Design a protein around this ligand. Structure first.
Ligand SMILES: *[C@@H]1O[C@H](CO)[C@@H](O[C@@H]2O[C@H](CO)[C@@H](O)[C@H](O)[C@@H]2O)[C@H](O)[C@H]1NC(C)=O
Ligand SMILES: *[C@@H]1O[C@H](CO)[C@@H](O[C@@H]2O[C@H](CO)[C@@H](O)[C@H](O)[C@@H]2O)[C@H](O)[C@H]1NC(C)=O
Ligand SMILES: *[C@@H]1O[C@H](CO)[C@@H](O[C@@H]2O[C@H](CO)[C@@H](O)[C@H](O)[C@@H]2O)[C@H](O)[C@H]1NC(C)=O
Ligand SMILES: *[C@@H]1O[C@H](CO)[C@@H](O[C@@H]2O[C@H](CO)[C@@H](O)[C@H](O)[C@@H]2O)[C@H](O)[C@H]1NC(C)=O
Ligand SMILES: *[C@@H]1O[C@H](CO)[C@@H](O[C@@H]2O[C@H](CO)[C@@H](O)[C@H](O)[C@@H]2O)[C@H](O)[C@H]1NC(C)=O
Ligand SMILES: *[C@@H]1O[C@H](CO)[C@@H](O[C@@H]2O[C@H](CO)[C@@H](O)[C@H](O)[C@@H]2O)[C@H](O)[C@H]1NC(C)=O
Lengths: 438, 135, 98, 98, 49
């Protein structure tokens, strides 16, 4: 830092960042009686003494499932009209096959989306109708068959994976065809070079810089897309948020199962042996102890699921805001959509989450020359309409704030308002004008 | 040879060895699931559709034939009102290939609604919106 | 609490390192404006950075450069008043205390 | 309000306001063993009869602690490099010693 | 009794941690917006422009 030293980026780079945001988790519909009393009529009768106590848990789980469906709808169903990409794909030299859907693939998902799907393992699929193959599992039965024994169900999401991929494809086609106009009203199409020029104009960089560098910008974008694809492929875990969500849900279910095997301070943890080896009038104490323990475990699971659902709903609201701002527009807020001056963002469907490809404009190699707050031509202070008053070293120039494109100081690019004796740091220089010459 | 029991990760009996023939058998839950009743407004109509969540409902049909299902009531299963989805199969509602907006969400991209055939509940794949190819 | 097993772990980022992070943020925001928050830190003299901010809020740079001394005096008076208010107010940090 | 009357400020004041936000809380490390059965082998043995409950408690507290650490990191460590203020502090008449 | 007390404490701590996480996300957003840049969102970072 110095009194009259400014650094202006003579170049720039296009960097694509990846943002991982969960939007929903596995919806659970745990039943009261099956988990509390295994097919025991008198045990269910004793549980009835607790009143409408587990109806609260059932209502909470139903509300959680409805909330997950609403979160997915809010995040992905932003546009009520599905937009299809043009049959040919030449967006001013911009690669888009990596993020656009691949019709060859049976699921009609983009390569990035398929990599994300293969990089995430779901403990409980749910939408597979696992019954029928649970008995034919040959090996030891997995978590799902055991869960289906003690009142644990995983309702499938309202939007299928292919359906969410279709929604993401519609958003992507709308964005890359009509810019951001489809996020406000009708999809007003615009050529991709023009859309990129206006995204550049939205970050304080003039429109001409993109058209002068139409190439080496598309190449940079393609290189960034390929680099992030390889980074997600070869990374240890870049889907940490979604993996954490899935693991937390699965392990909460596992703990809920494991609490059945606990005796909860009673003679045994097995209901049928208890009521068979002890007559009901005496065994009622053991039954009540088991019911209190299992109900406390179910309460803990439901409360933990509610807290995790609140966290997931906050994350899904953040993802919906990120979509509506970065995807359907260009957010001027810093660091909201990637690191750097945000240009675009490409949604990518992920298992129980969303993936944002924040295309950000980042400066590059820069040199610091000189600056002056104002230029005095004839007893008057001249200020730049846009940009700063940079200097080669001998002759001053006006240039953009975020790109080194020097221009001669005319009377149209700078406005004059002052008296040459009020600005601290005004420098001696001459300004021209297209009127006095002719 | 010394193994008689059989368990899994979450400490539940998975398989059992036959003590009389020295053969192995694995154990699976019988038909556990969840019943959800799909219905339009009771001021509109009284017909309902029952969704047995998460079950291959061919087994539900054979259980109905054996009359061993826990719910006492029995919806009409005339063959047309069966549609195996990924959240069980809807009984009492037919499937139409037409795509409309969601009215009563079910799961796995299936939504049931009341429509004229003369009124019945029809299940269908939800329509995300009017497709609009941008020029 | 410690003798009952209810111990508290210390934060990974100590107070000195948190203060160092805040100092780095302050240096960046007073010597490079918003450039250090996007890419490389680009040096900009503070009067010109204030002109940038004024133009961002929608008033021209001349309204700053014409009364830069007045703006600096107002800034200093405001920061001194902030310090005095923090001194005097007993519950200015009510959220952290809560 | 009139049909053809607009009010425009002929001056301006630069006022800095303080905003305080919690970023993290104390990272507690409660352990079941002491708290429920302080030095009691039999009590611990009957505590094992309640299943994997204290494992859940320890996991939740560890998650809370790492959440506090990540909150502090996200709030403060927004810059990879630690920028330093220049040795001479004259930012066009502005005062940052406070 | 101790298990109920500890569960109550852990649940309250989880709720407080969620609130603190929301506040810390807000603080990080404020840092990124009105520290690493100028925020046009009025009445977000200080009263006034
Ligand atoms: C701005 O930065 C670009 C890359 O970030 C430069 O493009 C490179 O140009 C070299 C030739 O100089 C090529 O070999 C290379 O493949 C790449 O395209 C670009 O030249 C640079 N421009 C300036 C003015 O520095
Ligand atoms: C967009 O980028 C694709 C790379 O992901 C290009 O596909 C390539 O095609 C070549 C053969 O031409 C393969 O060898 C390569 O592995 C990759 O599949 C695609 O051509 C490109 N499209 C445009 C319009 O540039
Ligand atoms: C001041 O800015 C000038 C831009 O018009 C630069 O002018 C160039 O100077 C070279 C000689 O160094 C000429 O050959 C060329 O045609 C052009 O006029 C000039 O270099 C620059 N001065 C410094 C010191 O960088
Ligand atoms: C910019 O150029 C002006 C000439 O057009 C300079 O004005 C001069 O001011 C001195 C007194 O400082 C007079 O003695 C002289 O006759 C002339 O009017 C002005 O100083 C200069 N500014 C800078 C910053 O160099
Ligand atoms: C805008 O408001 C400023 C303070 O809010 C005024 O500055 C004052 O200037 C007087 C001298 O004129 C000092 O005595 C006082 O301490 C303060 O610095 C400034 O004049 C005012 N400008 C206009 C045009 O009203
Ligand atoms: C920036 O503002 C500081 C006040 O917080 C000034 O420090 C003052 O220094 C004087 C002595 O010169 C003390 O008497 C006073 O109590 C206070 O500490 C500091 O000088 C000022 N910086 C500049 C460059 O003016």
């Amino acid at each position: 830092y110095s009194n009259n030293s400014i650094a202006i980026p003579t170049n720039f780079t296009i960097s694509v960042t990846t943002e991982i945001l969960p939007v929903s988790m596995t919806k659970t519909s745990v039943d009261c009686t099956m988990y509390i009393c295994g097919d025991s009529t008198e045990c269910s009768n004793l549980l009835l003494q607790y009143g409408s106590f587990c109806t609260q848990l059932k209502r909470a789980l139903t509300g959680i499932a409805v909330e997950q469906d609403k979160n997915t709808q809010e995040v992905f169903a932003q546009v009520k009209q599905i937009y299809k990409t043009p049959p040919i794909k030449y967006f001013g030299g911009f690669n888009f096959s990596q993020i656009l859907p691949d019709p060859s693939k049976p699921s009609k998902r983009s390569p990035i989306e398929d990599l994300l799907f293969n990089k995430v393992t779901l403990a409980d699929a749910g939408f597979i109708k696992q019954y029928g193959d649970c008995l034919g599992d040959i090996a030891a039965r997995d978590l799902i068959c055991a869960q289906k024994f003690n009142g644990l169900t995983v309702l499938p999401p309202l939007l299928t994976d292919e359906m969410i991929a279709q929604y993401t494809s519609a958003l992507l086609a709308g964005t890359i065809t009509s810019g951001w106009t489809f996020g406000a009203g009708p999809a007003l199409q615009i050529p991709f070079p023009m859309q990129m020029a206006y995204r550049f104009n939205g970050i304080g960089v003039t429109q001409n810089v993109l058209y002068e560098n139409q190439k080496l910008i598309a190449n940079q974008f393609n290189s960034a897309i390929g680099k992030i694809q390889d980074s997600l492929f070869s990374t240890p875990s870049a889907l940490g948020k979604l993996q954490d969500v899935v693991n937390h849900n699965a392990q909460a279910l596992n703990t809920l199962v494991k609490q059945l095997s606990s005796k909860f301070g009673a003679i045994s943890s097995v209901l049928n042996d208890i009521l068979s080896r002890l007559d009901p009038p005496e065994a009622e104490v053991q039954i009540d102890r088991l019911i209190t323990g299992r109900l406390q475990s179910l309460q803990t699971y439901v409360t933990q699921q509610l807290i995790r659902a609140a966290e997931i709903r906050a994350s899904a609201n953040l993802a919906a805001t990120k979509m509506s701002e970065c995807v359907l527009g260009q957010s001027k807020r810093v660091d909201f959509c990637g690191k750097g001056y945000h240009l675009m963002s490409f949604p990518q469907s992920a298992p129980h989450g969303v993936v944002f490809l924040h295309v950000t404009y980042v400066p590059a190699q820069e040199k610091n020359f000189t600056t002056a707050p104002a230029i005095c031509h004839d007893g008057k202070a001249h200020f730049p309409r846009e940009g700063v008053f940079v200097s080669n070293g001998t002759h001053w120039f006006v240039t953009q704030r975020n790109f080194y494109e020097p221009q001669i100081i005319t009377t149209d690019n700078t406005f004059v308002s002052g008296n040459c004796d009020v600005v601290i740091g005004i420098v001696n220089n001459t300004v021209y004008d297209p009127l006095q010459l002719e | 040879p010394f193994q008689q029991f059989g368990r899994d990760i979450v400490d539940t009996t998975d398989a059992v060895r036959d003590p009389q023939t020295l053969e192995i058998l694995d154990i699976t839950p019988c038909s556990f699931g969840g019943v959800s009743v799909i219905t339009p407004g009771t001021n509109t109509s009284n017909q309902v559709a029952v969704l047995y969540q998460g079950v291959n409902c061919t087994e539900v049909s054979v259980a109905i034939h054996a009359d061993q299902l826990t719910p006492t009531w029995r919806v009409y299963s005339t063959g047309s009102n069966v549609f195996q989805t990924r959240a069980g199969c809807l009984i009492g509602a037919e499937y139409v290939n037409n795509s409309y907006e969601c009215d009563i969400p079910i799961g796995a991209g299936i939504c049931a609604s009341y429509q004229t055939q003369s009124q019945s509940i029809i299940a269908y794949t939800m329509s995300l919106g009017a497709e609009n190819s941008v020029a």
